[PDB]
Symmetry: C2
Subunit: 129 residues, 2 copies
């Protein structure tokens, strides 16, 4: 769906995520953007979609993340709401469900998102520019 | 040359570069690691090799870079020595000379190098790990 508004949806959510830091946003994900190997737009998206289902699934209720304060619980709940909202959107654009995450280094989620954010602002320029 | 010591060569030079900041290391390069599209290890390397010949070639003698002080000229001269040393090494591993840099966003060189550094520490783990 190269140029659907789905991209803007992915984009407006990537900033709600990159704004709000939380306890867990320093946990790590397999840095799937550490290849050279190369994939195709569709699997980039499946691979990222995959990296994120893992994550939120493993940390929705992680003692290290839930928070103590009601500020903390709230940000956590938001973080997760948002990761599945991007998640939904990435698998929608993927339109493939096959995923062979292979890379090895890990990256904090915070950086993973920073990078999906760029790759995604770039798909966007290529759609108007 | 997937796993030749050429990788260690690329690696020991990527740190001499990421250590030393200079005036110019904030100039920009076409962020070739802003695709989804995907390429193959060989062209990743050609594309990066290409991005770097451009750069040093355009800034070896750039008034904004030469420096005023003898500390400044020295770092500049080093920066350039080093970019062609990585350059030589990337085109050697490439073993392709065809390059269609297409991406649009730009990234400071400093970040471009940060990222080549990772992709390269990862080729390395995959060669021993």
């Amino acid at each position: 769906h190269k140029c659907d508004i789905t991209l803007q949806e992915i984009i407006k959510t990537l900033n709600s995520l990159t704004e709000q830091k939380t306890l867990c946003t320093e946990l790590t994900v397999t840095d799937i953007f550490a290849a050279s190997k190369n994939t195709t737009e569709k699997e980039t998206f499946c691979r990222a979609a995959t990296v994120l289902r893992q994550f939120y699934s493993h940390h929705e209720k992680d003692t290290r993340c839930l928070g103590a304060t009601a500020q903390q619980f709230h940000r956590h709940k938001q973080l997760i709401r948002f990761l599945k909202r991007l998640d939904r959107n990435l698998w929608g654009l993927a339109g493939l469900n096959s995923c062979p995450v292979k890379e090895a280094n890990q990256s904090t989620l915070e950086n993973f998102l920073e990078r999906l954010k760029t790759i995604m602002r770039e798909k966007y320029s290529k759609c108007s520019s």
